[PDB]
Amino acid sequence: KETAAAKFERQHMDSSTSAASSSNYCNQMMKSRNLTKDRCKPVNTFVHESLADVQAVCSQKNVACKNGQTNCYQSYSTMSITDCRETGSSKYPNCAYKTTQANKHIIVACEGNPYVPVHFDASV
Ligand SMILES: Nc1ncnc2c1ncn2[C@@H]1O[C@H](COP(=O)(O)OP(=O)(O)O[C@H]2C[C@H](n3ccc(=O)[nH]c3=O)O[C@@H]2COP(=O)(O)O)[C@@H](OP(=O)(O)O)[C@H]1O
């Protein structure tokens, strides 16, 4: 029974690499973090910042979530992120992803005690 917070770190945290590495970064990471285990997840963002820095976003700019809830927060500063999007020539179980390194503000949804990120909403 993985916690939502643990799931968040699994699906979005990559503090090892400070920037999107190889052109094959997404193909490798999406596979390794078990994101293509029963479906190719269409889009996934990895954050290359410390866990503490990302957790801090939960006490930063409160903004509306794409779903209407209000437990979302935007980082005051931009962070190093890598967007992984599925390519059309991608078919389960041979999932294929386009890698995209960027520096943007991230928006996460937080929950619990402690108040930690559990969902990645968007980057701006
Ligand atoms: N306000 C909220 N909005 C959305 N979810 C919320 C909210 N508050 C709490 N949650 C809860 O957080 C857990 C993880 O959310 P989930 O969408 O499953 O994962 P993700 O990694 O964010 O995966 C998401 C984000 C990722 N994604 C999307 C866009 C992008 O730029 N990058 C990226 O990684 O793609 C997926 C689809 O994008 P979308 O739902 O925004 O359309 C869930 O709980 P459980 O799975 O434990 O039941 C959920 O109920």
Curated annotation (Swiss-Prot):
The keyword 4Fe-4S does not apply. Glycans are attached at residues 1, 7, 34, 37, 41. GO terms for cellular component: extracellular region. Pancreas. Disulfide bonds join 26-84, 40-95, 58-110, 65-72. GO terms for biological process: defense response to Gram-positive bacterium. Substrate binds at residues 7, 10, 41-45, 66, 85. The active site is at residues 12, 119. It is found in: Secreted. The keyword Transmembrane helix does not apply. Its EC number is 4.6.1.18. It catalyses: an [RNA] containing cytidine + H2O = an [RNA]-3'-cytidine-3'-phosphate + a 5'-hydroxy-ribonucleotide-3'-[RNA]; an [RNA] containing uridine + H2O = an [RNA]-3'-uridine-3'-phosphate + a 5'-hydroxy-ribonucleotide-3'-[RNA]. It is an enzyme of class 4 (lyase). Keywords: Disulfide bond, Endonuclease, Glycation, Glycoprotein, Hydrolase, Lyase, Nuclease, Secreted, Signal. GO terms for molecular function: lyase activity; nucleic acid binding; ribonuclease A activity; RNA nuclease activity. Endonuclease that catalyzes the cleavage of RNA on the 3' side of pyrimidine nucleotides. Acts on single-stranded and double-stranded RNA. Belongs to the pancreatic ribonuclease family. Interacts with and forms tight 1:1 complexes with RNH1. Dimerization of two such complexes may occur. Interaction with RNH1 inhibits this protein. Monomer. This is Ribonuclease pancreatic. The chain holds residues 27 to 150 of 150 of the full protein.
